[PDB]
């Protein structure tokens, strides 16, 4: 039977300061006991001073980030280059994730 | 006969131009934008004295920060208002924020040209969409059935529009207060209306950042009418 | 007067669009003829290549619908090819569904029913073509069935189509009045083709070179067209007697 | 495109009338007269066949009177082919109701729906309306004996006595004159035939030019019987009433 | 593309006339004469084989058609319209009846189905009415022998005898004088041939006349033996020779 | 005359009048100018107002980081076509990780407009577009007509009185093409070009609209006091 | 599907199909609505061209949409059935989803929206019907009376009439109905409604229908004799 | 009358006037030609330089279908592009199912049927282009020309547009003077000449020459544009002949 | 779980001399629980009788369905449907639900009004016809009924004798079945008279 999910490992960490924020993540990509890459970026600059990382199943993580970056692009087109606030980005991401409630993105996401 | 989406030799859509004639027959609606808020006012124009005038709803809330006045075939506006309200609330669902007045107006105007042989004809109503947001502040837009929308400092639509617009040309300046704008709408409405203006056959409204969109009571408007009469008699 | 633009009845009970489609049939100014032998069915048609820039090999109004069925068309080539493609598709589908080769008369009926629909349904126009189907049927033997824009079809002993159809028709009528049989009593198809060409020459009153004619022959289990050199051999035999 | 050839069957005239409905009514006015009369103990349905021939097989013929179910029947005036389309819909309908509620369909409910179907053809679809007017004769346990009529507009009304088709103006006057509320079926039979005999365009009213039917509680005890009259039975009732 | 003619092409005129139906009836009037006569023990239907060309094999064109083993049909008007109606009539006899009840439909109900098809072409979008009048003769167990006419409007009437097409007015008068309720099938065939001779100009023989009957069961035409209840079709098309034999005693 | 009722009808001389009437809507529209060098491509647009209380209708729309256009005619039709371009530019990026070629963008607009000229029921687009962009083969300028015709040019202008600006560019061809690595001078040439189409009115701060794209320059629009430099 | 645009604008900015639908309403029998202090009365004309009618089974002019709301109309009868059916379905749908009966204003807004939809949808013509919708909101004693028309506009009325000769009865109501003091009782409200119809009706026999609607789903239709008593009293006072 | 107002309506002649009006749009367009040579085909087209502002060699008119078929057309350019888009879909589905690249005669019918389909209904307009196309397949070289009616034939030489008569006359001379045949490189030279000679009918504005070719020997049976030195050599040959 | 044995019940039909008989039990249950002792499983459409065993909702549903179809048949044909024709209609109607069948065991019984010939037939749940000369059985005690019918039955029985035979077949089969009983009914059918008799049996 075909299993559409996988586990690419990795770990991410977000800490919020008083006037700054960090989003860290290891660069290792794996399947089972093998290493795929020792340097495969996992945390991305998505625009509007927002950084994002979707950790777990890399194929679903790459798809979500790709879709959010796209959501930012169209937010500018549709709303006069308005800056997407972090709280608005979070709510948008909820709707990206729940749009596949019955075939989920197998990722834990942090922005 | 002929197509509904047909161009005239001058390069205009027949049906869009004909819908503009229907809007000219409609009751007058006026909007004035200031730095203290945007004021919206309308002529109710009851067809009979037995008609309970308070049921005439030509000024309408879209969201807490966006209001709307209409002129023309007012029945056509209901689905536009419904779409506007849905768009405003849906954006709040997706983005956890108020929607820009321009974006809301654009969403309404996207419906305009969705007609052919979709709906069977253009809308026969013009809208004055007034509101406030953090980016562009207090705004007033004029949404037509052509799908075009212009931003205005002040605007009049309906039967007494060109007479009222000429009056708004002279009276408007960038330092207008809200109270001054209220009286100015009442003044111009009284000028273009057939019947004598009072609190029952005319309605005021405004949108401020603090209190949001509010339709004025007949008691509140009555005082502004009495305040107008005295200041005109003062010179 | 919109009753003349679409296929609805006029006050006289007529369909003018169907009648005008019949007139488009002769637009090519080509005459065709079909006859039956003992073992074969022959069809001949005039070939006219007016432009020197044309590739004469591609100029044809005879079509190989299936291995057994051949079709000659009288009318403009676009409608002719439209009908040809449809007939080919129908013949193939028939074999797949019913497990045997589509008969000539059954295909004719099917195409005639399609033509009928265009005379009844408004959005579809009639095809301005007359379709003459030929084969050697395994049950009925040598067969000629012809369809027109009205949706009419019928079997034939022999037939002719085009601007000068009447002259050819009467010529054939007079021959069968003498012989008192429904076919050309001849063993080889070569001589049946010679008969067809000879009687077209007599009827039209024109001589033919190898490039002036186009010939189709139906035998048991195959239909085929003749090349220019095959026709030349046919013309030589006619002249030598 | 196709717009060029569209007659636009579902539009108002400047006077606020539906062109096709009015023209359909004009068609129906040339159809054979049909009469319905409601009595205290039953209902009569009488109708005139249009210029028949001697070679027409009458005993197996049916152009006017149709059976919808055991309790309800209809008299037709207009295009017969159009009427049969509607009749079969009404029959299916009475059966749907019976399957759902396990009770015979009330007369008005059946009438309302046929009338709603007719209405639909006047408001949407771009098709011509049905050129048919019905007289519904039926019985149920709520309102008892009932007469209704429907026309191409899809409007329906209830009646004590009514005519459709040709010469309804003359026929309705004659019915309005001689009709009384305490009337019985046998009297209503006589009225229906006398009215046709005076309004007919034919030289004389004969058995071969008529279709006739009754709905009676004249069935053994509390129940209702439909009687579609045979040619010989129409001939007898014509002699009995003193017309031939 | 798409069929954008979703509106009626037949509409009521101010006078109440349905123009396209009237015009269809005019097309039927121009058509070749056909007739039907009902006897006590059978029905006969007949028409002229109007051959378009002497080179054409008129045997291949069948104006009289079998719809079911006990029901036959003949027409006047547009031939192609008739051909497709026969195809639909044959199919509807199976789909709306035989596949449900396991037996062929009675004449009146098959006629009803054909009538429905013709009515729909009078009201549906983007179509014209059929330009034919049908005469349908048939037999069934509970109704016996019957003969029906079906017009372009979809209206149908049962007849003792009738005629349609070119010389129908004269032919119907001729049939009124000759018809009675005690006619045997052979007498009806004889009357049919007499009536049909009046409307024919040219050759009058078995090769130019098409005639069929609904009569006794034909076990010889069934194609198999072994089932007593299956006794064969009542529809039979008369041969060219069988017609000529009755033309000598004419 | 009898052949202008719909887009599906040729006239006896082989003309499509509904398309020609749609072309007429462009001529009524306000003037806009397009021109390019080897390094940069510039759009200059004269915005139009309803009256003194009204705003000046926006003429320039961004399609991607490397592409955008200016409009003349029915603005809603420009919104539809620009939205289509946005989607196509975006499809190219998401699927092929490839910036859409300006030439291919023109081919897509041509094909979209064409479908509206051959089918019954619909109508032609009532707007003309000037597309600029910088891709792998350098700077580009395209002119779109709603007939479907798309043309790659060094410079052009569309709208009312556009013939004046088009003549100027035809004279200046050899000069402005050489303006490489100098955005301000290329805009100056565009502002001077659009000035040849002006009558009565002149270029004010809220009247003028400029856009630019180039080698190391994303598509950006300049309005308000940002164009006061060029007045 | 049939998509043809039947309702379209004309050069002078009119939608003729909607305006011709109003002409159908003008042809229809007169209907009147009057609201008192604690009730609403709906009066309807019955044309006496149709006698030999069975009044038991003939569709009544006033239709209950729910137990607390009624709807009368003027114009095409067949068209009105479609609106009434839709209104009745929506009334049950509202109870089913929101657990409250519709307000009179809501029901009117729905019906008016349906009418409007038929003025800019392809392949359909406008309803040749104007309605008077009356009733009392749940747990409310304030009378409600609304009017709709083919275009889709709606509004509330102290008193209103529609149909043929509505101009005359509206004239009567405008001078007789006082807003400061409306019909205090049911009698006064019915009397004024009958009086208004007597300006137009012809005979006061079986030509006048009256339906009284009171708060808390109390709806009743008056009989011929009850109405005839009002007709008698009115004319006896008039002889002076 | 009124028979010319709607497509797919037969006149009393038996003609479809709407298709004949589409031909007028073709006759209004620029000149385009096709020449069949020994082992392939050559296509050439006249591009009118409306203005100096037109970028040279950028507005390409000739289009490739698959990798072995070339298409050129005169008339409404968008209509031609639409037809080629369909041609590419037809060629793709043929190769998808049958593996081999679509033969030219097979391809010719695919366009023919599609164009003919636009003469069957009043809901569509006929194509406003005559299309010259062809290439090399397993059976050798083929040249075709396709009219608005859906009519097409095979050709030794083909021409359409405003200068078609002038072109046709020149093509007829080549057929007579070269019965044994014409080489691919010769055909390119002759193609240039014919476009230059046909330009006398569009002599107001100056023009740009565009040539393409498929040849078994010269291009390995693939469609390619004539560029650089070979194009300039053809232009020089053409300019020498007019003087 | 087995739909054909949730509600329980039996039907049996027999031919005689110029007559037919059809009988059924009256039980309706929910497995072990007895719910009704008045659930008759025999219906008639004119002079054609139909007995149905199996799932009670489908029994009720099919009755309403065949009532629907026979009423329309009669309106169009202008005559009552005959057993041979009805049998084909039942088969047709069951097979149209081939892959979502009604869980029933129908039994047709009647006399052709024209030929006078007695007729019975049985079906499986999806339409296969069993046209028998002697007898037809259906239900949860079908095995028991087969044993009784096959031993007690003899051809050309008179109505009053046939009654005793079919009654004893039913009663003794029902008393060896837990899911059948709680009363019984027997229809005796002749060309123009039909008698219906309720039998006295053990109520456990
Ligand atoms: Cl077929
Ligand atoms: Mg047609
Ligand atoms: Mg018909
Ligand atoms: Mg037991
Ligand atoms: Mg027990």
State the burial class of residue I93 (Cβ atoms within 10 Å of its Cβ: 0-12, 13-18, 19+): middle
Give yes or no for a contact between B63 and B98, defined as CB atoms under 8 angstroms apart: yes
Domain count, chain I: 1
Of the candidates E145, E124, E151, E143, the residue with the CA atom closest to the CA atom of residue E45: E145
Give the strands of the sheet with C222-225, arranged side by side: C158-161, C32-36, C41-46, C213-219, C222-225
Phi (first) and psi of residue H150, to 5 degrees: 100, -5
Give yes or no for a contact between C117 and C124, defined as CB atoms under 8 angstroms apart: yes
Q: Does E117 touch chain C (CB under 8 A)?
A: no
Q: What angle do CA F110, F187, F38 make, to 5 degrees?
A: 60
Of the candidates B139, B155, B123, B124, the residue with the CA atom closest to the CA atom of residue B42: B155
Domain count, chain C: 1
Is the Cβ pair B112, F6 closer than 8 Å?
no
Residue C114 CA to ligand 1 center (angstroms) comes to: 7
Q: How far is CA C161 from CA A60, C31, C65, in A?
A: 69, 6, 19
Assign residue E81 the CATH number of its domain.
Answer: 3.60.20.10
Is the Cβ pair H4, F12 closer than 8 Å?
yes
Question: D176 contacts in G (CB within 8 Å)?
Answer: 51-52
Q: Does E40 touch chain D (CB under 8 A)?
A: no
Grouping H, G, I as helix, E, B as strand and the rest as coil, residue G71 is: strand
Q: Alpha-carbon distance E168 to E176, whole Å?
A: 12
Q: Alpha-carbon distance H236 to D148, whole Å?
A: 94
Question: B112 contacts in F (CB within 8 Å)?
Answer: 76
Q: What is the DSSP letter of C174?
A: H
Give the strands of the sheet with I20-25, arranged side by side: I135-139, I10-15, I20-25, I184-190, I193-199
Q: What is the DSSP string of H42-55?
A: EEEEEEE---TTBP
Q: What is the 3-state secondary structure (H, E, C) of H10-49?
A: CCCCCCCHHHHHHHHHHHHCCCEEEEEECCEEEEEEEEEC
Q: Alpha-carbon distance D244 to D194, whole Å?
A: 11
Taking each helix axis as running N to C, give the angle between helix I56-77 and helix E107-120, from 0 to 180 degrees, rounded to the nearest 10: 90
Count D/G contacts: CB-CB distance under 8 Å.
106
Q: Alpha-carbon distance E35 to E167, whole Å?
A: 10
Task: Please identify which residue in the block is written with the tokens 């004809």.
Answer: B121
Q: Alpha-carbon distance I50 to I90, whole Å?
A: 10
Contacts of D37 (CB under 8 A, 6+ apart): D43, D44, D46, D147, D160, D161, D175, D179, D183, D188, D191, D192
Q: C80 to chain H nearest CA, in Å?
A: 10
Superfamily of domain covering F1-231 = Aminohydrolase, N-terminal nucleophile (Ntn) domain (3.60.20.10)
Q: Alpha-carbon distance G89 to H204, whole Å?
A: 73
Residue I124 CA to ligand 5 center (angstroms) comes to: 28
Task: Please identify which residue in the block is written with the tokens 């028309």.
Answer: G149
Give yes or no for a contact between C131 and C168, defined as CB atoms under 8 angstroms apart: no
CA G136 from centre of chain: 15
Q: What angle do CA C227, C229, C235 make, to 5 degrees?
A: 110
Give yes or no for a contact between E183 and E42, defined as CB atoms under 8 angstroms apart: no
Chain A residue with minimal CA distance to B95?
A: A88
Q: Alpha-carbon distance B99 to B97, whole Å?
A: 6
Question: G1 contacts in E (CB within 8 Å)?
Answer: 6
Instruction: Say which ligand is closest to the CA of C5.
Output: 2
Q: What is the DSSP string of A12-46?
A: EEEEE-SS-EEEEE---EEETTEEEES-----EEE
Contacts of B217 (CB under 8 A, 6+ apart): none
Q: C123 to chain D nearest CA, in Å?
A: 8
Q: Give me the CATH topology for the region D1-244.
A: 3.60.20
Mutation pick from E100, E111, E113, E227 vs chain I, by most beta carbons of I within 10 Å, is E100
Helices (H), chain B: 14-24, 77-95, 101-112, 161-171, 178-192, 218-233
Residue G43 CA to ligand 4 center (angstroms) comes to: 68
Return the exposure string of C81-119: e unless at least 16 CB atoms fall within 10 Å of the residue's CB, then b: bbbbbbbbebbeebeeeeeebbbbbbbbbbbbbbbbebb
Query: What is the enclosing helix (H) or strand (E) of F92?
Result: helix F75-96
Q: Determine the straight-line distance between the first and last CA of chain A, rounded to whole angstroms.
A: 35
Q: Alpha-carbon distance F152 to F133, whole Å?
A: 11
Q: Cα dihedral sign for D104, D108, D110, D111?
A: positive
Contacts of B211 (CB under 8 A, 6+ apart): none
Residue I25 CA to ligand 4 center (angstroms) comes to: 10
Domain boundary assignment for chain H: 1-243
Q: Alpha-carbon distance B39 to B100, whole Å?
A: 18
Give yes or no for a contact between G77 and G27, defined as CB atoms under 8 angstroms apart: no
Mutation pick from D3, D12, D129 vs chain G, by most beta carbons of G within 10 Å, is D12
Q: Alpha-carbon distance D150 to G172, whole Å?
A: 36
Structural tokens at position G2: 């049939």
Give yes or no for a contact between G145 and G35, defined as CB atoms under 8 angstroms apart: yes
Tell me how crowded residue H211 is: count the other CB atoms within 10 A of its CB.
Answer: 24
Q: C157 to chain E nearest CA, in Å?
A: 6
Of the candidates H161, H168, H237, H166, the residue with the CA atom closest to the CA atom of residue H197: H166
Give yes or no for a contact between I122 and I132, defined as CB atoms under 8 angstroms apart: yes
Task: Please identify which residue in the block is written with the tokens 């009222």.
Answer: B164
Give yes or no for a contact between H195 and H45, defined as CB atoms under 8 angstroms apart: yes
Q: Give strand pairing partners of G177.
A: none
Of the candidates A65, A58, A36, the residue with the CA atom closest to the CA atom of residue A106: A58
Question: B93 contacts in A (CB within 8 Å)?
Answer: 91, 95
Phi (first) and psi of residue D104, to 5 degrees: -65, 140
Of the candidates B40, B24, B28, the residue with the CA atom closest to the CA atom of residue B189: B28
Question: D156 contacts in G (CB within 8 Å)?
Answer: 59
Q: What angle do CA H141, H144, H150 make, to 5 degrees?
A: 150
State the burial class of residue D169 (Cβ atoms within 10 Å of its Cβ: 0-12, 13-18, 19+): exposed
Q: Alpha-carbon distance E43 to E215, whole Å?
A: 6
Q: Alpha-carbon distance B119 to D242, whole Å?
A: 65
Residue H30 is a catalytic residue: yes
Is the Cβ pair B11, F73 closer than 8 Å?
yes
Helices (H), chain E: 19-30, 79-93, 99-101, 107-120, 168-178, 185-199, 240-248
Q: Does C158 touch chain E (CB under 8 A)?
A: yes
Taking each helix axis as running N to C, give the angle between helix F75-96 and helix B101-112, from 0 to 180 degrees, rounded to the nearest 10: 110
Superfamily of domain covering G1-240 = Aminohydrolase, N-terminal nucleophile (Ntn) domain (3.60.20.10)
Q: What is the 3-state secondary structure (H, E, C) of H136-205?
A: EECCEEEEEEECCCCCEEEECEEEECCCHHHHHHHHHHHHHHCCCCCCHHHHHHHHHHHHHHHHHHHCCC
Chain B residue with minimal CA distance to A86?
A: B95
Residues recorded for chain I: 204
Range of the domain at E100: 1-250
Q: C77 to chain H nearest CA, in Å?
A: 6
Of the candidates E155, E135, E130, the residue with the CA atom closest to the CA atom of residue E196: E135
Q: Alpha-carbon distance E122 to C5, whole Å?
A: 19
Q: Cα dihedral sign for B82, B84, B90, B92?
A: negative
Q: Alpha-carbon distance H13 to H188, whole Å?
A: 42
Q: Alpha-carbon distance E190 to E183, whole Å?
A: 11
Catalytic-role residue among H30, H119, H131, H160: H30
- In chain D, which residues touch C (CB < 8 A)? 2, 4-5
Q: Alpha-carbon distance D126 to F42, whole Å?
A: 54
Q: Cα dihedral sign for G10, G15, G21, G27?
A: negative
Of the candidates D138, D141, D140, D158, the residue with the CA atom closest to the CA atom of residue D149: D158
Q: Alpha-carbon distance E161 to E188, whole Å?
A: 10
Q: Alpha-carbon distance A1 to A16, whole Å?
A: 43
Assign residue I8 the CATH number of its domain.
Answer: 3.60.20.10
Q: Give strand pairing partners of I130.
A: I122
Grouping H, G, I as helix, E, B as strand and the rest as coil, residue E126 is: coil
Q: Alpha-carbon distance C116 to C147, whole Å?
A: 10
CATH of domain H1-243: 3.60.20.10
Of the candidates H102, H34, H118, H19, the residue with the CA atom closest to the CA atom of residue H73: H34
Q: Alpha-carbon distance H175 to H143, whole Å?
A: 14
Q: Alpha-carbon distance C38 to C44, whole Å?
A: 17
Q: Alpha-carbon distance G64 to G77, whole Å?
A: 16
Task: Please identify which residue in the block is written with the tokens 């030279």.
Answer: H189
Q: Alpha-carbon distance E5 to F202, whole Å?
A: 55
Q: How far is CA B53 from CA B188, G132, G168, in A?
A: 21, 17, 22
Grouping H, G, I as helix, E, B as strand and the rest as coil, residue E214 is: strand
**Given the DSSP bridges, would you call strands I10-15 and I135-139 parallel, antiparallel or unpaired?**
antiparallel
Rg (CA), chain F: 18
Query: What is the enclosing helix (H) or strand (E) of I121?
Result: strand I118-123
Q: How far is CA F167 from CA F33, F163, G84, H158, in A?
A: 12, 6, 68, 38
Q: Alpha-carbon distance C40 to C68, whole Å?
A: 11
Q: Alpha-carbon distance D143 to D152, whole Å?
A: 25
Grouping H, G, I as helix, E, B as strand and the rest as coil, residue A91 is: helix
Q: How far is CA I78 from CA D104, E106, E108, I84, in A?
A: 20, 11, 11, 17
Grouping H, G, I as helix, E, B as strand and the rest as coil, residue I114 is: coil
Q: CATH assignment of B1-235, given 3.60.20.10, 3.40.50.150, 3.30.930.10, 3.30.160.270?
A: 3.60.20.10
Residues recorded for chain B: 235
Contacts of H141 (CB under 8 A, 6+ apart): H36, H37, H38, H39, H40, H41, H134, H135, H214, H216
Query: What is the enclosing helix (H) or strand (E) of C202?
Result: helix C189-204
Chain F residue with minimal CA distance to H58?
A: F152
Q: Alpha-carbon distance G234 to G192, whole Å?
A: 10
Grouping H, G, I as helix, E, B as strand and the rest as coil, residue D109 is: helix
Give yes or no for a contact between E231 and E223, defined as CB atoms under 8 angstroms apart: no
Grouping H, G, I as helix, E, B as strand and the rest as coil, residue D119 is: helix
Task: Please identify which residue in the block is written with the tokens 């007559």.
Answer: I19
- Experimental method used, please? X-ray
Grouping H, G, I as helix, E, B as strand and the rest as coil, residue B27 is: coil
Residue I59 CA to ligand 4 center (angstroms) comes to: 20
């Amino acid at each position: 039977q075909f299993n559409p999910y996988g586990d690419n490992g990795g770990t991410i960490l977000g800490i919020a300061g008083e006037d700054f924020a960090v989003l860290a993540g290891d660069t290792r990509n794996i399947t089972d006991y093998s290493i795929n890459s020792r340097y495969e970026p996992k945390v991305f600059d998505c625009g509007d001073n927002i950084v994002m990382s979707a950790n777990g199943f890399a194929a679903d993580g790459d798809a979500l980030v790709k879709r959010f970056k796209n959501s930012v692009k169209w937010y500018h087109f549709d709303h006069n280059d308005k800056k997407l606030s972090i709280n608005s980005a979070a709510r948008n991401i909820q709707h990206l994730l729940y749009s596949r409630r019955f075939f989920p993105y197998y990722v834990y996401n942090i922005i | 006969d002929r197509g509904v989406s047909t161009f005239s030799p001058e390069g205009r859509l027949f049906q869009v131009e004909y819908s503009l004639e229907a809007i000219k027959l409609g009751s007058t609606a006026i909007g004035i934008a200031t730095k203290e808020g945007v004021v919206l006012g309308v002529e109710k124009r009851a067809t009979s004295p037995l008609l309970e005038s308070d049921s005439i709803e030509k000024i309408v809330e879209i969201d807490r920060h966006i209001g709307c006045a209409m002129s023309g075939l007012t029945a056509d506006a209901r689905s536009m208002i419904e779409h506007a309200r849905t768009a405003a609330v849906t954006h709040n669902l997706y983005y956890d924020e108020d929607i820009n007045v321009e974006s809301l107006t654009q969403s309404v105007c996207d419906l305009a040209l969705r007609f052919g042989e979709l709906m069977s004809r253009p809308f026969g109503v013009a809208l004055l969409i007034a509101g406030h947001d953090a980016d562009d502040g207090y705004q007033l837009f004029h949404a037509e059935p052509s799908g075009t929308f212009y931003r205005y400092n002040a605007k009049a639509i309906g039967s007494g529009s060109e007479g009222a617009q000429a009056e708004l040309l002279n009276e408007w300046h960038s330092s207008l207060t809200l109270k001054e704008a209220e009286l100015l709408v009442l003044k111009i409405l009284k000028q273009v209306m057939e019947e004598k203006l009072d609190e029952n056959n005319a309605q005021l409204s405004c949108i401020t950042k603090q209190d949001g969109f509010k339709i004025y009571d007949n008691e509140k408007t009555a005082e502004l009418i009495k305040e107008l009469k005295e200041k005109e008699a003062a010179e | 007067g919109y009753d003349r633009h679409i296929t609805i009845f006029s006050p006289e009970g007529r369909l003018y669009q169907v009648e005008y489609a019949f007139k488009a049939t002769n637009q090519t100014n080509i005459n065709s003829l079909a006859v039956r032998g003992k073992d074969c069915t022959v069809v001949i048609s005039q070939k006219k290549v007016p432009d020197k820039l044309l590739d004469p090999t591609t100029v044809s109004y005879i079509f190989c619908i299936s291995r057994t069925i051949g079709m000659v068309v009288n009318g403009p080539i676009p409608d002719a090819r439209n009908a040809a493609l449809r007939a080919k598709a129908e013949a193939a589908e028939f074999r797949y569904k019913y497990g045997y080769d589509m008969p000539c008369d059954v295909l004719a009926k099917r195409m005639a029913n399609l033509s009928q629909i265009y005379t009844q349904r408004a959005y579809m126009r009639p095809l301005g073509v007359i379709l003459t189907f030929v084969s050697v049927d395994e049950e009925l033997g040598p067969s000629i069935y012809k369809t027109d824009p009205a949706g009419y079809y019928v079997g034939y002993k022999a037939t002719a189509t085009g601007p000068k159809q009447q002259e050819i028709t009467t010529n054939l009528e007079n021959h069968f009045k003498k012989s008192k049989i429904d076919h050309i009593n001849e063993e080889s198809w070569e001589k049946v083709v010679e008969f067809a060409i000879t009687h077209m020459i007599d009827a039209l009153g024109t001589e033919f070179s190898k490039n002036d004619l186009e010939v189709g022959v139906a035998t048991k289990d195959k239909f085929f067209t003749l090349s220019a050199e095959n026709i030349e051999e046919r013309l030589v035999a006619i002249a030598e007697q | 495109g196709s717009r060029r050839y569209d007659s636009r069957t579902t539009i108002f005239s400047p006077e606020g009338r539906l062109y096709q409905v009015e023209y359909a009514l004009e068609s129906i006015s040339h159809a054979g007269t049909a009469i319905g009369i409601m009595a205290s103990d039953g209902i009569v349905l009488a109708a005139e066949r249009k210029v028949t021939s001697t070679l027409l097989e009458q005993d197996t013929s049916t152009e006017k009177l149709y059976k919808l179910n055991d309790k309800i029947a209809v008299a037709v005036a207009g295009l017969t082919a159009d009427a049969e389309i509607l009749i079969n819909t009404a029959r299916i309908h009475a059966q749907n109701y019976l399957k759902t509620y396990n009770e015979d369909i009330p007369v008005e409910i059946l009438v309302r729906r046929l009338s709603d179907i007719k209405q639909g053809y006047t408001q949407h679809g771009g098709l011509r309306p049905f050129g048919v007017s019905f007289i519904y004769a039926g019985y149920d346990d709520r309102y008892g004996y009932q007469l209704y009529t429907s026309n191409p507009s899809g409007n329906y009304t209830g009646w004590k006595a009514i005519s459709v088709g040709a010469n309804t103006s003359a026929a309705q006057t004659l019915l309005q004159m001689d009709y009384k509320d305490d009337m019985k079926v046998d009297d209503a039979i006589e009225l229906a035939l006398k009215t046709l005999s005076k309004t007919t365009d034919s030289s004389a009213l004969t058995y071969d030019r008529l279709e006739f039917a009754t709905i009676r509680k004249g069935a053994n005890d509390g129940e209702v019987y439909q009687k579609i009259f045979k040619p010989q039975e129409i001939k007898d009732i014509l002699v009995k009433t003193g017309i031939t | 593309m798409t069929d954008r003619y979703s509106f009626s092409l037949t509409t009521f005129s101010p006078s109440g006339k349905l123009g396209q139906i009237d015009y269809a009836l005019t097309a039927v009037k121009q058509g070749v004469t056909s007739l039907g006569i009902k006897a006590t023990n059978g029905v006969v239907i007949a028409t002229e084989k109007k051959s378009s060309s002497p080179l054409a094999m008129s045997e291949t064109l069948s104006k009289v058609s079998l719809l079911t083993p006990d029901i036959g049909a003949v027409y006047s008007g547009m031939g192609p319209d008739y051909r497709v109606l026969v195809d639909k009539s044959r199919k509807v006899a199976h789909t709306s009846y035989k596949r449900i009840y396991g037996e062929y439909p009675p004449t009146k109900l098959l006629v009803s189905e054909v009538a429905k098809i013709m009515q729909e072409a009078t009201q549906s979008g983007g179509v014209r009415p059929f330009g034919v009048s049908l005469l349908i003769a048939g037999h069934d167990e509970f109704n016996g022998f019957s003969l029906y006419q079906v017009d372009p409007s979809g209206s149908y009437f049962p007849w003792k005898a009738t005629a349609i097409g070119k010389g129908s007015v004269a032919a119907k008068t001729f049939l009124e004088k000759r018809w009675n309720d005690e006619l045997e099938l052979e007498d009806a065939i004889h009357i049919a041939l007499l009536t049909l001779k009046e409307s024919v100009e040219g050759e009058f023989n078995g090769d130019t006349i098409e005639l069929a009957i609904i009569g006794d069961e034909n076990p010889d035409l069934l194609g198999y033996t072994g089932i007593p209840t299956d006794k064969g079709p009542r529809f039979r098309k008369l041969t060219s020779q069988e017609i000529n034999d009755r033309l000598e005693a004419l | 005359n009898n052949y202008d009722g719909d887009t599906v009808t040729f006239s006896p001389t082989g003309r499509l009048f509904q398309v020609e009437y749609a072309l007429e809507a462009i001529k009524q529209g306000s003037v806009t100018v397009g021109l390019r060098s080897n390094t940069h491509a510039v759009l200059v647009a004269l915005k139009r107002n309803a009256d003194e209380l009204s705003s000046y209708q926006k003429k320039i729309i961004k399609c991607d980081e490397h592409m955008g256009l200016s409009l003349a005619g029915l603005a809603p039709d420009a919104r539809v076509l620009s939205n289509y371009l946005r989607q196509q530019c975006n499809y190219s990026s998401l699927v092929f990780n490839r910036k859409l070629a300006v030439e291919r963008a023109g081919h897509l607009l041509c094909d979209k407009a064409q479908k509206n000229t051959q089918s019954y029921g619909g109508r032609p687009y009532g707007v003309g577009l000037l597309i600029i962009g910088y891709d792998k083969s350098g700077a580009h300028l395209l002119e779109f007509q709603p007939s479907g015709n798309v043309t790659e040019l060094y410079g052009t202008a569309i709208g009312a009185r556009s013939q004046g600006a088009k003549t100027y560019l035809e004279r200046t061809l050899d000069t402005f093409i050489k303006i490489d690595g100098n955005p301000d001078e290329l805009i100056k040439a565009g502002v001077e070009a659009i000035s040849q189409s002006l009558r009565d009115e002149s270029l004010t701060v809220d009247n003028l609209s400029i856009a630019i794209v180039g080698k190391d320059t994303p598509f950006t629009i300049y309005d308000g006091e940002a164009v006061a430099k060029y007045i | 599907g049939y998509d043809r645009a039947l309702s379209i604008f004309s050069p002078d900015g009119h939608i003729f199909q909607v305006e011709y639908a109003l002409e159908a309403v003008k042809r229809g029998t007169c209907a009147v609505g009057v609201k008192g202090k604690n009730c609403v009365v709906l009066g309807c004309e019955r044309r006496s061209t149709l006698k030999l009618q069975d009044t038991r089974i003939t569709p009544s002019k006033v239709s209950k949409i729910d137990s607390h709301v009624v709807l009368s109309f003027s114009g095409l009868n067949a068209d009105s059935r479609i609106l009434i059916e839709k209104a009745r379905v929506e009334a049950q749908s509202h109870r089913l989803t929101l657990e409250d009966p519709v307000t009179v204003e809501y029901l009117t807004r729905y019906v008016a929206g349906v009418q409007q939809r038929y003025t800019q949808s392809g392949g359909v013509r406008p309803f040749g019907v104007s309605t008077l919708i009356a009733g009392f909101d749940p747990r409310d004693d304030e009378p409600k009376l609304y009017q709709t028309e083919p275009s889709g506009i709606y509004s509330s009325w102290s008193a209103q009439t529609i149909g043929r000769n509505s101009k005359t009865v509206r004239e009567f109501l405008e001078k007789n109905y006082d807003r400061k003091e409306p019909p205090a009782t049911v009698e006064e409200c019915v009397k004024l409604t009958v009086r208004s119809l007597l300006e137009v009706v012809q005979t006061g026999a079986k030509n006048i229908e009256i339906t009284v609607v009171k708060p808390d789903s109390d709806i009743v239709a008056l009989s011929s004799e009850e109405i005839n008593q009002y007709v008698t009293q009115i004319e006896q006072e008039k002889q002076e | 009358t009124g028979y010319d107002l709607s497509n797919s309506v037969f006149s009393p002649d038996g003609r479809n006037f709407q298709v004949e009006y589409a031909v007028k749009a073709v006759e209004n367009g620029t000149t385009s030609i096709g020449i069949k040579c020994n082992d392939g085909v050559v296509f050439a087209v006249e591009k009118l330089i409306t203005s100096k502002l037109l970028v040279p060699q950028k507005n390409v008119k000739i289009q490739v279908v698959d990798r072995h078929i070339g298409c050129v057309y005169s008339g409404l350019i968008p209509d031609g592009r639409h037809l080629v888009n369909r041609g590419r879909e037809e060629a793709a589905s043929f190769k998808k199912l049958y593996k081999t690249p679509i033969p030219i005669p097979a391809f010719a019918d695919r366009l023919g049927q599609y164009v003919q389909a636009h003469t069957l209904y009043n809901s569509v307009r006929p194509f406003g282009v005559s299309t010259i196309f062809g290439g090399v397949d397993k059976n050798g070289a083929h040249l075709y020309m396709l009219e608005p009616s859906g009519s097409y034939w095979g050709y030794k030489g083909a021409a359409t547009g405003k200068g078609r008569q002038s072109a046709k006359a020149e093509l007829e001379k080549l057929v007579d003077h070269h019965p044994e045949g014409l080489s691919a490189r010769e055909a390119v030279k002759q193609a240039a000449k014919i476009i230059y000679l046909a330009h006398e009918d569009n002599k107001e504005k100056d023009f740009e020459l565009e040539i393409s070719w498929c040849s078994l020997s010269e291009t390995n049976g693939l469609h390619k544009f004539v560029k650089g030195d070979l194009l300039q050599e053809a232009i020089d040959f053409a300019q020498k002949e007019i003087n | 779980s087995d739909p054909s044995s949730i509600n329980g019940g039996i039907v049996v039909a027999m031919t005689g001399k110029d007559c037919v008989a059809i009988a059924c039990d009256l039980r309706l249950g929910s497995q072990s629980l007895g719910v009704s002792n008045k659930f008759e499983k025999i219906f008639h459409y004119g002079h054609v009788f139909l007995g149905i065993t199996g799932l009670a909702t489908d029994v009720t549903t099919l009755n309403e369905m065949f009532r629907y179809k026979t009423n329309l048949y009669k309106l169009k044909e202008e005559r009552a449907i005959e057993p041979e024709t009805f049998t084909q209609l039942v088969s047709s109607s069951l097979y149209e639900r081939r892959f979502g069948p009604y869980f029933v065991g129908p039994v047709v019984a009647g006399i052709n009004s024209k030929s006078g010939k007695p007729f019975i037939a049985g079906f499986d749940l999806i339409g296969c016809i069993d046209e028998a000369k002697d007898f037809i059985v259906s239900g949860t005690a079908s095995d028991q009924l087969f044993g009784m019918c096959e031993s007690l039955y003899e051809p050309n029985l008179e109505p009053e004798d046939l009654f005793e035979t079919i009654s004893q077949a039913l009663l003794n089969a029902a008393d060896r079945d837990a899911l059948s009983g709680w009363g019984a009914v027997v229809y005796i059918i002749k060309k123009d008279e039909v008698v219906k008799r309720y039998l006295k049996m053990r109520q456990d």
